[PDB]
Amino acid sequence: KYFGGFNFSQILPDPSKPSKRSPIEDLLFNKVTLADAGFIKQYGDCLGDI
Amino acid sequence: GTGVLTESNKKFLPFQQFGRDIADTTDAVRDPQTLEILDITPCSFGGVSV
Amino acid sequence: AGCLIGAEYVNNSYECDIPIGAGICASYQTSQSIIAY
Numbered sequence: 563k564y565f566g567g568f569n570f571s572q573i574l575p576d577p578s579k580p581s582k583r584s585p586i587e588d589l590l591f592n593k594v595t596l597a598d599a600g601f602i603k604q605y606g607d608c609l610g611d612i
Numbered sequence: 613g614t615g616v617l618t619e620s621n622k623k624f625l626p627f628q629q630f631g632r633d634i635a636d637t638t639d640a641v642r643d644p645q646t647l648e649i650l651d652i653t654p655c656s657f658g659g660v661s662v
Numbered sequence: 663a664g665c666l667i668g669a670e671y672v673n674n675s676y677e678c679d680i681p682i683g684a685g686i687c688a689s690y691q692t693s694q695s696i697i698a699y
Protein backbone atom coordinates (compact mmCIF):
# COMPACT_ATOMS: atom_id res chain seq x y z
CA LYS A 563 0.00 0.00 0.00
CA TYR A 564 2.70 2.50 -1.00
CA PHE A 565 0.78 4.88 -3.27
CA GLY A 566 3.62 7.32 -3.81
CA GLY A 567 3.26 8.77 -0.31
CA PHE A 568 -0.50 9.25 -0.15
CA ASN A 569 -2.26 7.46 2.70
CA PHE A 570 -5.61 5.87 1.84
CA SER A 571 -6.00 3.73 4.98
CA GLN A 572 -8.98 5.85 6.06
CA ILE A 573 -11.07 4.97 2.98
CA LEU A 574 -9.74 1.53 2.06
CA PRO A 575 -11.54 -1.42 3.68
CA ASP A 576 -10.38 -2.61 7.09
CA PRO A 577 -9.98 -6.42 7.18
CA SER A 578 -9.76 -6.66 10.97
CA LYS A 579 -13.39 -5.68 11.50
CA PRO A 580 -15.98 -8.42 10.81
CA SER A 581 -17.76 -5.93 8.56
CA LYS A 582 -15.20 -5.11 5.88
CA ARG A 583 -15.86 -1.36 6.06
CA SER A 584 -13.34 1.46 6.20
CA PRO A 585 -13.23 3.55 9.40
CA ILE A 586 -15.07 6.47 7.77
CA GLU A 587 -17.89 4.15 6.68
CA ASP A 588 -18.08 2.72 10.20
CA LEU A 589 -18.29 6.23 11.66
CA LEU A 590 -21.02 7.42 9.30
CA PHE A 591 -22.85 4.10 9.68
CA ASN A 592 -22.92 4.45 13.47
CA LYS A 593 -24.02 8.09 13.29
CA VAL A 594 -27.22 7.33 11.36
CA THR A 595 -29.64 5.86 13.91
CA LEU A 596 -31.61 3.90 11.34
CA ALA A 597 -34.71 1.87 12.22
CA ASP A 598 -35.38 -1.82 11.69
CA ALA A 599 -35.21 -2.82 8.01
CA GLY A 600 -36.79 -6.20 7.39
CA PHE A 601 -35.86 -8.40 10.33
CA ILE A 602 -37.46 -11.85 10.74
CA LYS A 603 -39.56 -11.18 13.90
CA GLN A 604 -40.70 -14.86 14.07
CA TYR A 605 -43.77 -13.39 15.89
CA GLY A 606 -42.24 -14.48 19.25
CA ASP A 607 -40.23 -11.25 19.72
CA CYS A 608 -43.37 -9.29 18.80
CA LEU A 609 -45.33 -10.72 21.75
CA GLY A 610 -44.14 -9.40 25.09
CA ASP A 611 -43.75 -6.27 27.19
CA ILE A 612 -40.95 -4.75 25.09
CA GLY B 613 -61.53 -10.10 19.84
CA THR B 614 -59.28 -12.65 18.17
CA GLY B 615 -55.69 -13.45 19.02
CA VAL B 616 -53.34 -15.27 21.37
CA LEU B 617 -53.76 -14.73 25.10
CA THR B 618 -50.58 -14.84 27.17
CA GLU B 619 -49.49 -14.06 30.72
CA SER B 620 -48.72 -10.34 30.86
CA ASN B 621 -46.19 -9.50 33.56
CA LYS B 622 -47.36 -5.87 33.73
CA LYS B 623 -49.60 -4.66 36.57
CA PHE B 624 -52.85 -2.74 36.18
CA LEU B 625 -54.07 -0.17 38.64
CA PRO B 626 -57.03 -1.75 40.47
CA PHE B 627 -59.92 0.48 39.36
CA GLN B 628 -59.43 0.50 35.57
CA GLN B 629 -60.19 -2.72 33.73
CA PHE B 630 -58.13 -3.09 30.54
CA GLY B 631 -55.19 -1.48 28.78
CA ARG B 632 -54.62 -0.09 25.29
CA ASP B 633 -51.74 0.80 22.96
CA ILE B 634 -51.02 3.58 20.44
CA ALA B 635 -54.25 2.89 18.57
CA ASP B 636 -57.47 2.49 20.54
CA THR B 637 -57.16 -1.30 20.37
CA THR B 638 -57.25 -3.60 23.37
CA ASP B 639 -53.71 -4.70 24.23
CA ALA B 640 -54.43 -6.29 27.64
CA VAL B 641 -57.46 -7.37 29.65
CA ARG B 642 -58.37 -8.60 33.14
CA ASP B 643 -60.00 -12.06 33.25
CA PRO B 644 -63.39 -11.88 35.04
CA GLN B 645 -63.00 -15.18 36.91
CA THR B 646 -59.46 -15.40 38.32
CA LEU B 647 -58.74 -11.65 37.91
CA GLU B 648 -55.67 -12.34 35.76
CA ILE B 649 -54.07 -9.71 33.52
CA LEU B 650 -53.45 -11.09 30.03
CA ASP B 651 -51.60 -10.11 26.86
CA ILE B 652 -53.33 -9.89 23.47
CA THR B 653 -51.73 -10.42 20.06
CA PRO B 654 -53.27 -11.17 16.65
CA CYS B 655 -52.16 -14.46 15.13
CA SER B 656 -49.10 -14.34 12.86
CA PHE B 657 -49.50 -13.42 9.19
CA GLY B 658 -47.67 -11.89 6.23
CA GLY B 659 -48.28 -11.85 2.52
CA VAL B 660 -47.18 -14.74 0.35
CA SER B 661 -45.31 -14.48 -2.93
CA VAL B 662 -44.79 -16.76 -5.92
CA ALA C 663 -36.85 -11.97 3.58
CA GLY C 664 -38.97 -14.94 4.67
CA CYS C 665 -39.32 -18.69 4.49
CA LEU C 666 -39.29 -19.91 0.89
CA ILE C 667 -40.50 -23.40 0.04
CA GLY C 668 -39.67 -25.28 -3.14
CA ALA C 669 -36.12 -24.16 -3.96
CA GLU C 670 -32.80 -25.80 -3.14
CA TYR C 671 -30.06 -23.56 -1.77
CA VAL C 672 -26.91 -23.78 -3.89
CA ASN C 673 -23.42 -22.78 -2.77
CA ASN C 674 -22.58 -21.37 -6.22
CA SER C 675 -23.07 -17.75 -7.27
CA TYR C 676 -24.55 -16.29 -10.44
CA GLU C 677 -25.74 -12.92 -11.62
CA CYS C 678 -29.42 -13.53 -11.13
CA ASP C 679 -32.79 -12.74 -12.69
CA ILE C 680 -35.47 -13.31 -10.04
CA PRO C 681 -34.69 -11.20 -6.95
CA ILE C 682 -36.02 -12.62 -3.66
CA GLY C 683 -34.38 -10.16 -1.26
CA ALA C 684 -31.40 -9.57 1.03
CA GLY C 685 -28.94 -10.99 -1.48
CA ILE C 686 -30.71 -14.28 -2.08
CA CYS C 687 -32.31 -14.59 -5.50
CA ALA C 688 -33.73 -17.62 -7.30
CA SER C 689 -33.50 -18.89 -10.87
CA TYR C 690 -34.35 -21.99 -12.94
CA GLN C 691 -31.46 -24.37 -13.52
CA THR C 692 -30.56 -28.05 -13.38
CA SER C 693 -33.31 -33.04 -13.09
CA GLN C 694 -34.14 -29.36 -13.56
CA SER C 695 -35.73 -27.30 -10.78
CA ILE C 696 -35.56 -23.93 -9.00
CA ILE C 697 -32.40 -23.00 -7.11
CA ALA C 698 -31.69 -20.21 -4.61
CA TYR C 699 -28.25 -18.62 -4.29
Ligand SMILES: *[C@@H]1O[C@H](CO)[C@@H](O)[C@H](O)[C@H]1NC(C)=O
Pocket residue numbers: 567568569571572
Ligand atom coordinates in the same frame (compact mmCIF):
# COMPACT_ATOMS: atom_id res chain seq x y z
C1 LIG D 1 -1.43 6.22 7.42
O1 LIG D 1 -2.64 6.44 8.14
C2 LIG D 1 -2.82 5.50 9.20
C3 LIG D 1 -4.18 5.72 9.85
O2 LIG D 1 -4.29 7.09 10.26
C4 LIG D 1 -1.70 5.65 10.22
O3 LIG D 1 -1.87 4.70 11.27
C5 LIG D 1 -0.35 5.44 9.54
O4 LIG D 1 0.70 5.71 10.47
C6 LIG D 1 -0.23 6.37 8.34
N1 LIG D 1 1.00 6.08 7.62
C7 LIG D 1 1.59 7.00 6.87
C8 LIG D 1 1.94 6.57 5.48
O5 LIG D 1 1.84 8.12 7.29
